[PDB]
């Protein structure tokens, strides 16, 4: 009947950026009006499509990628961006066609003692290809002597944790991102507006 956008944005728990979650949106009428009128998103950048002219464009499939990063990394969720999240966690293609939506979630994803449940990848041998997911936990060798699964001299764990506490600056507070990507094949369109 109607696309379950509620299960993505209003989810009780979000995933870490290194293991970002993708939900497939198909065979439903997609109401983007709610997202337009909603004045709670700190980011609503669309690429290849305009958000206004969206309730009249049908697509074969819609994909919603969701994760949590900090404020100064939201700028990396865009085509042609580099840093530590776009290189080791979540990379968008240059010819991206979709929207990036993000909002501040300090009241939910911050613990007073420290929220260490959200993680991000810190080391990797090469940058991620577009829409690639890496969840391996093998020790990253950054030195001459190799690492046999043990940390030490130039042997670090590939995953690191965010602090996520209410006393940080906005640049370090947790932000929930939903990346809506649209694909259009030479096939009947199941998701309209």
């Amino acid at each position: 009947n109607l696309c379950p956008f509620g299960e993505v944005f209003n989810a009780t728990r979000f995933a870490s950026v290194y293991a970002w979650n993708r939900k497939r949106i198909s065979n439903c009428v997609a109401d983007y009006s709610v997202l337009y009128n909603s004045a709670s998103f700190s980011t609503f950048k669309c690429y290849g499509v305009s958000p206004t002219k969206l309730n009249d464009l049908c697509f074969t499939n819609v994909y919603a990628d969701s994760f949590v990063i900090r404020g100064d990394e939201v700028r990396q969720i865009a085509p042609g961006q580099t840093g530590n999240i776009a290189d080791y966690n979540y990379k968008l293609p240059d010819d991206f066609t979709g929207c990036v939506i993000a909002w501040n979630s300090n009241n939910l994803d911050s613990k007073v003692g420290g929220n260490y449940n959200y993680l991000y990848r810190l080391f990797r041998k090469s940058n991620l290809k577009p829409f690639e997911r890496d969840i391996s936990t093998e020790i990253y060798q950054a030195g001459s002597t190799p690492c046999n699964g043990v940390k030490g001299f130039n042997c670090y764990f590939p995953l690191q944790s965010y602090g996520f506490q209410p006393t940080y600056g906005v640049g370090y507070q947790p932000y929930r991102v939903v990346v809506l990507s649209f694909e259009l094949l030479h096939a009947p369109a199941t998701v309209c507006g």
């Epitope: 613990k111 007073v112 003692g113 420290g114 260490y116 602090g163 209410p166 006393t167 940080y168 370090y172």
Partner: antibody
Framework: VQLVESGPGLVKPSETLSLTCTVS??????????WGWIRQPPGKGLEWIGS???????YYNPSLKSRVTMSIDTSKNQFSLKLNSVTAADTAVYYC???????????????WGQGTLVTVSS | EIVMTQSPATLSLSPGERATLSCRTS??????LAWYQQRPGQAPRLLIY???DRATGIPARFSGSGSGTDFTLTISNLEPEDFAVYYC??????????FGQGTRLETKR
């Protein structure tokens, strides 16, 4: 800013030690600072007890985690400390300081209080 | 467990010289470190936060070698009232807020 401690200077063993710190240089309801307690036995090193936020949640030390609770009162602009089942090894000077956590491993105590000496003996 | 070991326990130096306090963390994580100064009967004073940032009101003679695992607090020109006990403090995941054993700085003669 200034921090002042308050509470009985004597506590009998196996009883609760109550202390209240009152600040008078800023605001505890601020969304940028933590409020903690640090103790040190006479002639010994420093030992962080626990830090409390303006909300209600807080985090303490695993050693005294069971026999400790901390509380806050924005109205009176002060935070308190409770240490259950006090033994004779809790004989220390108890400070209340201001905590600032901007990043992740960055947790320093900005301005300390003078501190009160609570001696636990019978 | 991230154990904090300061060195040395006691430091014997005279006014005019420079002291080098060592606060090496256990073979593990690396990030920031805070140094404190405590005089007898006084609350410990914040000297340096975030590896090497002088606190509000610290003379330029204080500095920190905030690098990896092992850290170092350095006092350029030892003043008469600069001899006290110094504590380094970390904030790891578990346990949070570990304190060093302390370095006692005294005047050698």
């Amino acid at each position: 800013v200034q921090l002042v401690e308050s509470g009985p200077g004597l506590v009998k063993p196996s009883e609760t030690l109550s202390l209240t710190c009152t600040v008078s240089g800023g605001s505890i309801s601020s969304s940028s600072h933590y409020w903690g307690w640090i103790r040190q036995p006479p002639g010994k090193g420093l030992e962080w007890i626990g830090s409390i936020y303006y909300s209600e949640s807080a985090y303490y030390n695993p050693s005294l985690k069971s026999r400790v609770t901390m509380s806050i009162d924005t109205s009176k602009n002060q935070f308190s400390l409770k240490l259950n089942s006090v033994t004779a090894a809790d004989t220390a000077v108890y400070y209340c300081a201001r905590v600032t956590e901007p990043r992740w491993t960055s947790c320093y105590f900005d301005y300390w209080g003078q501190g009160t000496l609570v001696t636990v003996s019978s | 467990e991230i154990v904090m070991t300061q060195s040395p326990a006691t430091l014997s130096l005279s006014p005019g010289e420079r002291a080098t306090l060592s606060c090496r963390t256990s073979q593990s994580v690396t990030s920031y470190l805070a140094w404190y100064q405590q005089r007898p009967g006084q609350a410990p004073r914040l000297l340096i936060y975030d590896a090497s940032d002088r606190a509000t009101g610290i003379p330029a003679r204080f500095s920190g070698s905030g690098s990896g695992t092992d850290f170092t607090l350095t006092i350029s020109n030892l003043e008469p009232e600069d001899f006290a006990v110094y504590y380094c403090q970390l904030r790891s995941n578990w346990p949070p807020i570990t304190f060093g054993q302390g370095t006692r700085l005294e005047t050698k003669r």
